[PDB]
Enzyme design. Structure first.
Site, PDB file in Angstrom:
ATOM      1  N   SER A 293      33.946 -19.144  -4.925  1.00  0.00           N
ATOM      2  CA  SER A 293      35.531 -19.723  -5.113  1.00  0.00           C
ATOM      3  C   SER A 293      36.195 -19.979  -3.917  1.00  0.00           C
ATOM      4  CB  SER A 293      36.031 -18.672  -6.054  1.00  0.00           C
ATOM      5  OG  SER A 293      36.060 -17.378  -5.328  1.00  0.00           O
TER       6      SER A 293
ATOM      7  N   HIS B  24      34.650 -15.474  -2.074  1.00  0.00           N
ATOM      8  CA  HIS B  24      35.774 -16.022  -2.418  1.00  0.00           C
ATOM      9  C   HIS B  24      36.394 -16.399  -1.142  1.00  0.00           C
ATOM     10  CE1 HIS B  24      39.512 -17.126  -4.405  1.00  0.00           C
ATOM     11  NE2 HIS B  24      40.255 -16.533  -3.596  1.00  0.00           N
TER      12      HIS B  24
ATOM     13  N   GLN C 156      41.443  -8.467  -0.727  1.00  0.00           N
ATOM     14  CA  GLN C 156      42.203  -8.872   0.815  1.00  0.00           C
ATOM     15  C   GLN C 156      40.857  -9.544   1.647  1.00  0.00           C
ATOM     16  OE1 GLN C 156      44.135 -10.486   2.291  1.00  0.00           O
ATOM     17  NE2 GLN C 156      45.696  -9.262   1.764  1.00  0.00           N
TER      18      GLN C 156
ATOM     19  N   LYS D 162      43.675 -28.125   5.475  1.00  0.00           N
ATOM     20  CA  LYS D 162      43.279 -29.192   6.346  1.00  0.00           C
ATOM     21  C   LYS D 162      41.901 -28.635   7.325  1.00  0.00           C
ATOM     22  CE  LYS D 162      46.772 -32.250   6.460  1.00  0.00           C
ATOM     23  NZ  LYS D 162      46.453 -33.460   5.385  1.00  0.00           N
TER      24      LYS D 162
ATOM     25  N   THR E 226      47.610 -20.834  -3.771  1.00  0.00           N
ATOM     26  CA  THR E 226      48.465 -19.481  -3.522  1.00  0.00           C
ATOM     27  C   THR E 226      49.633 -19.557  -4.225  1.00  0.00           C
ATOM     28  OG1 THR E 226      49.229 -19.899  -1.409  1.00  0.00           O
ATOM     29  CG2 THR E 226      47.181 -18.789  -1.446  1.00  0.00           C
TER      30      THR E 226
ATOM     31  N   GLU F 164      40.307 -20.664  -2.436  1.00  0.00           N
ATOM     32  CA  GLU F 164      41.911 -20.276  -2.495  1.00  0.00           C
ATOM     33  C   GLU F 164      42.349 -21.184  -1.543  1.00  0.00           C
ATOM     34  OE1 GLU F 164      43.072 -16.492  -3.006  1.00  0.00           O
ATOM     35  OE2 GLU F 164      45.151 -16.748  -1.949  1.00  0.00           O
TER      36      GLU F 164
ATOM     37  N   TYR G 124      42.233  -3.779  -1.895  1.00  0.00           N
ATOM     38  CA  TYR G 124      42.359  -3.589  -0.525  1.00  0.00           C
ATOM     39  C   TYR G 124      41.283  -2.703   0.078  1.00  0.00           C
ATOM     40  CZ  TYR G 124      46.549  -6.148  -1.740  1.00  0.00           C
ATOM     41  OH  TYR G 124      47.148  -7.119  -2.319  1.00  0.00           O
TER      42      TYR G 124
ATOM     43  N   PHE H 150      46.980 -11.019   9.992  1.00  0.00           N
ATOM     44  CA  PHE H 150      46.043 -10.479   9.649  1.00  0.00           C
ATOM     45  C   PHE H 150      45.911  -8.679   9.565  1.00  0.00           C
ATOM     46  CE2 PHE H 150      42.588 -14.169  10.418  1.00  0.00           C
ATOM     47  CZ  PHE H 150      43.192 -14.676   9.343  1.00  0.00           C
TER      48      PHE H 150
ATOM     49  N   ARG I 264      51.338  -8.393  -7.090  1.00  0.00           N
ATOM     50  CA  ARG I 264      52.984  -8.080  -6.909  1.00  0.00           C
ATOM     51  C   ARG I 264      53.381  -9.328  -6.231  1.00  0.00           C
ATOM     52  NH1 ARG I 264      54.546  -3.711  -3.083  1.00  0.00           N
ATOM     53  NH2 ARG I 264      54.168  -5.597  -1.531  1.00  0.00           N
ATOM     54  N   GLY I 265      52.677  -9.645  -5.099  1.00  0.00           N
ATOM     55  CA  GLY I 265      53.354 -10.570  -4.299  1.00  0.00           C
ATOM     56  C   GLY I 265      54.010  -9.910  -2.972  1.00  0.00           C
ATOM     57  N   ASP I 266      54.075 -10.676  -2.074  1.00  0.00           N
ATOM     58  CA  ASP I 266      54.804 -10.218  -0.606  1.00  0.00           C
ATOM     59  C   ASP I 266      56.256 -10.279  -0.678  1.00  0.00           C
ATOM     60  OD1 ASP I 266      52.215  -9.928   0.920  1.00  0.00           O
ATOM     61  OD2 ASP I 266      52.262 -12.101   1.205  1.00  0.00           O
TER      62      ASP I 266
HETATM   63  C1  LIG Z   1      42.818 -12.585  -3.837  1.00  0.00           C
HETATM   64  C2  LIG Z   1      44.422 -12.368  -3.502  1.00  0.00           C
HETATM   65  C3  LIG Z   1      45.428 -13.455  -3.611  1.00  0.00           C
HETATM   66  C4  LIG Z   1      46.549 -13.378  -3.346  1.00  0.00           C
HETATM   67  N1  LIG Z   1      47.696 -14.193  -3.750  1.00  0.00           N
HETATM   68  C5  LIG Z   1      48.602 -14.172  -3.443  1.00  0.00           C
HETATM   69  C6  LIG Z   1      49.715 -14.967  -3.788  1.00  0.00           C
HETATM   70  O1  LIG Z   1      49.346 -16.449  -4.425  1.00  0.00           O
HETATM   71  N2  LIG Z   1      51.062 -15.113  -3.488  1.00  0.00           N
HETATM   72  C7  LIG Z   1      51.466 -13.945  -2.606  1.00  0.00           C
HETATM   73  O2  LIG Z   1      52.673 -14.092  -2.524  1.00  0.00           O
HETATM   74  N3  LIG Z   1      50.402 -12.997  -2.464  1.00  0.00           N
HETATM   75  C8  LIG Z   1      49.484 -12.984  -2.825  1.00  0.00           C
HETATM   76  N4  LIG Z   1      48.647 -11.958  -2.538  1.00  0.00           N
HETATM   77  C9  LIG Z   1      48.995 -10.879  -1.609  1.00  0.00           C
HETATM   78  C10 LIG Z   1      49.448  -9.740  -2.378  1.00  0.00           C
HETATM   79  O3  LIG Z   1      50.510 -10.250  -3.192  1.00  0.00           O
HETATM   80  C11 LIG Z   1      50.038  -8.840  -1.434  1.00  0.00           C
HETATM   81  O4  LIG Z   1      49.052  -8.132  -0.723  1.00  0.00           O
HETATM   82  C12 LIG Z   1      51.021  -7.751  -2.002  1.00  0.00           C
HETATM   83  O5  LIG Z   1      51.680  -7.120  -0.987  1.00  0.00           O
HETATM   84  C13 LIG Z   1      50.062  -6.573  -2.852  1.00  0.00           C
HETATM   85  O6  LIG Z   1      49.886  -7.434  -4.144  1.00  0.00           O
HETATM   86  P1  LIG Z   1      49.075  -6.434  -5.282  1.00  0.00           P
HETATM   87  O7  LIG Z   1      49.030  -7.407  -6.391  1.00  0.00           O
HETATM   88  O8  LIG Z   1      47.734  -5.950  -4.564  1.00  0.00           O
HETATM   89  O9  LIG Z   1      50.042  -5.252  -5.508  1.00  0.00           O
HETATM   90  P2  LIG Z   1      50.065  -3.849  -6.246  1.00  0.00           P
HETATM   91  O10 LIG Z   1      48.647  -3.564  -6.907  1.00  0.00           O
HETATM   92  O11 LIG Z   1      51.325  -3.571  -7.000  1.00  0.00           O
HETATM   93  O12 LIG Z   1      50.212  -2.756  -4.932  1.00  0.00           O
HETATM   94  C14 LIG Z   1      51.296  -2.558  -4.149  1.00  0.00           C
HETATM   95  C15 LIG Z   1      51.671  -1.109  -3.671  1.00  0.00           C
HETATM   96  O13 LIG Z   1      52.031  -0.264  -4.724  1.00  0.00           O
HETATM   97  C16 LIG Z   1      51.106   0.765  -4.723  1.00  0.00           C
HETATM   98  N5  LIG Z   1      50.991   1.274  -6.170  1.00  0.00           N
HETATM   99  C17 LIG Z   1      50.468   0.534  -7.161  1.00  0.00           C
HETATM  100  N6  LIG Z   1      50.516   1.335  -8.161  1.00  0.00           N
HETATM  101  C18 LIG Z   1      51.401   2.161  -7.958  1.00  0.00           C
HETATM  102  C19 LIG Z   1      51.784   3.310  -8.944  1.00  0.00           C
HETATM  103  N7  LIG Z   1      51.701   3.308 -10.030  1.00  0.00           N
HETATM  104  N8  LIG Z   1      52.720   4.215  -8.277  1.00  0.00           N
HETATM  105  C20 LIG Z   1      52.845   3.972  -6.757  1.00  0.00           C
HETATM  106  N9  LIG Z   1      52.555   3.221  -6.148  1.00  0.00           N
HETATM  107  C21 LIG Z   1      51.517   2.292  -6.723  1.00  0.00           C
HETATM  108  C22 LIG Z   1      49.645   0.207  -4.221  1.00  0.00           C
HETATM  109  O14 LIG Z   1      48.735   1.198  -3.688  1.00  0.00           O
HETATM  110  C23 LIG Z   1      50.410  -0.620  -2.996  1.00  0.00           C
HETATM  111  O15 LIG Z   1      50.446   0.022  -1.740  1.00  0.00           O
HETATM  112  C24 LIG Z   1      46.806 -12.008  -2.700  1.00  0.00           C
HETATM  113  C25 LIG Z   1      46.008 -11.017  -2.223  1.00  0.00           C
HETATM  114  C26 LIG Z   1      44.837 -11.264  -2.543  1.00  0.00           C
HETATM  115  C27 LIG Z   1      43.894 -10.028  -2.271  1.00  0.00           C
END
Ligand SMILES: Cc1cc2nc3c(=O)[nH]c(=O)nc-3n(C[C@H](O)[C@H](O)[C@H](O)COP(=O)(O)OP(=O)(O)OC[C@H]3O[C@@H](n4cnc5c(N)ncnc54)[C@H](O)[C@@H]3O)c2cc1C
Lengths: 278, 287
Positions: free
Chosen positions: B16, B265, B175, B271, B49, B18, B144, B215, B102-104
């Site tokens: 895949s 993935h 990640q 580019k 993304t 991205e 992660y 990174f 969740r997103g950044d």
């Molecule tokens: C394949 C991939 C694609 C991505 N694509 C994008 C994209 O398109 N756009 C973008 O902005 N970012 C993207 N990201 C980045 C990602 O959004 C960030 O790493 C973000 O900081 C965390 O996303 P997540 O879905 O893992 O968060 P979550 O799973 O919600 O984790 C966030 C934090 O909360 C903690 N946590 C989770 N559940 C609980 C709970 N119940 N109680 C307390 N703490 C908890 C976790 O341990 C973690 O530290 C991508 C990452 C990956 C791996």
């Protein structure tokens, strides 16, 4: 202590050693002297491969008497169910808490015997329940398909395994790949990688033809161009095992099981070079 | 095709890709030329993304090319209702594959704060999707291997990962990582926690020294000492930094494929020839 509990105790990686039946009386005394020296490395458990049914019970006693923790190998090949249950009884009566249930090399079963290691696992659980800790062999490189092999592992785990120790391998990817098939199959028990450093060129036929291990290309090349230099082979084998174990420990393995030739210091060399002699 | 069905079929590794939001209309047309050229490779799925209206249109355009889109959907900076509306726009486009994130934090901000009427955890979005769509969609989440940078420990991170899987994940994509042992060690922690879902390794070849800060701090990936050594003594030679990154990724992926991963993935700058160069040297694309 039961290996089940030693593994949960999480007090760093466990290092275990498996030796071979001595060739003669002086070799047996040299093996038990080597076991006394091995306390330097705080081994979590030690074993001598099982063929020598009466000798192996006495070895388990001798290991205990040294303040070491014996893993008693028990096989079903070439024995009746009664014979296997008897050696089993003799081990546990002697204070053995840890059993490794193995089929044995040739397959055609003894006419009144078991066919599968899983039958020995089930026998132990029927007779002793959780009073003993039971391990089985895992084959990361299989034998039929890897998929059919993994179903046979699942079956044995479900017979009542607390842990598994792999067949020796030289390519860590094959061990990680087996762990991934196990995870996808819902297998959560500890699976300890087994490591035997290449100590001589003669060994490669045993490894490939008998044990079914594959020799990665870069190792095979170094070995066969140094094939007539015994010192070179040994250094190639120890270096290869150092790199293997360094990557296994970084990948959070629970321990490493070292297949040790009775006379060879290679396994000890691997742990010293990794900085893991206490 | 739902990714959970592609993974179940077990026909060898899924590959895949991205890509990143294009910067201008010429870039957008050059990105979609690239995707049209990729269809020859039969990627398992493709994504850009996560501009929420633009992201739905991009998913549509990927479908138009006969490619299988993975819709990235975040909760950051959006209300629950806005996230639900975008989600519905994807599903009604015939998107069957969602990546619930969740997103950044926003650009130049380093502390996540949920929108006051918004979700806090990706697990909340997974649960939303399952309640509203059930098995009409296949849902993935981020994993992660070295832990979220904002997680307190690997064991707490894994507990949170498990909760997200239990919310209704069919798969996860990691990640990016550079040290395969950290990926294998994550799978072993997942195995000990009884997590069985497919977990696809995410690979991004280092294409510039400047990326290393993103990174390590934002993504939370460690750089192995040898690779770090080589990058930090070639900083201002982008031809050689490219070569270092591609060769490191080839050696990673070679080991991952020998370890029978369910797929790879690739995070690909729009580019950047780096992914193509990795595939060629692995013998997956013609030179
Ligand atoms: C394949 C991939 C694609 C991505 N694509 C994008 C994209 O398109 N756009 C973008 O902005 N970012 C993207 N990201 C980045 C990602 O959004 C960030 O790493 C973000 O900081 C965390 O996303 P997540 O879905 O893992 O968060 P979550 O799973 O919600 O984790 C966030 C934090 O909360 C903690 N946590 C989770 N559940 C609980 C709970 N119940 N109680 C307390 N703490 C908890 C976790 O341990 C973690 O530290 C991508 C990452 C990956 C791996």
């Amino acid at each position: 202590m039961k290996i089940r509990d030693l593994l949960k105790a999480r007090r760093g990686p466990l290092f275990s050693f498996e030796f071979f039946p001595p060739k003669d009386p002086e070799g047996e005394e040299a093996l038990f002297r080597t076991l006394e020296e091995l306390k330097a490395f705080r081994p979590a458990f030690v074993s001598i491969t099982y063929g020598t049914r009466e000798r192996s019970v006495a070895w388990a006693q001798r290991i205990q008497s040294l303040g070491l923790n014996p893993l008693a190998h028990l096989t079903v090949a070439g024995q009746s169910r009664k014979e296997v249950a008897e050696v089993l009884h003799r081990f546990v009566e002697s204070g053995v808490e840890n059993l490794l249930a193995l089929r044995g090399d040739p397959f055609r079963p003894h006419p009144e015997g078991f066919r599968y290691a899983a039958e020995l696992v089930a026998l132990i659980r029927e007779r002793y329940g959780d009073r003993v800790s039971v391990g089985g062999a895992a084959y990361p490189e299989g034998h039929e398909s890897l998929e059919a092999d993994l179903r046979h592992f699942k079956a044995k785990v479900e017979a009542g395994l607390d842990f598994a120790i792999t067949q020796l391998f030289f390519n860590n990817a094959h061990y990680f790949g087996f762990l991934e098939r196990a995870r996808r199959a819902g297998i959560g028990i500890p699976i300890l990688p087994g490591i035997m450093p290449v100590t001589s060129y003669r060994q490669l036929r045993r490894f490939t033809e008998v044990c079914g291990a594959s020799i990665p290309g870069p190792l095979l090349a170094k070995l066969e161009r140094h094939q007539d230099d015994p010192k070179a082979v040994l250094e190639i084998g120890v270096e290869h095992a150092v790199r293997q174990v360094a990557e296994l420990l970084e990948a959070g393995v629970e321990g490493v099981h070292f297949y040790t030739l009775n006379k060879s210091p290679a396994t000890r060399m691997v742990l010293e070079r990794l900085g893991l002699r206490p």
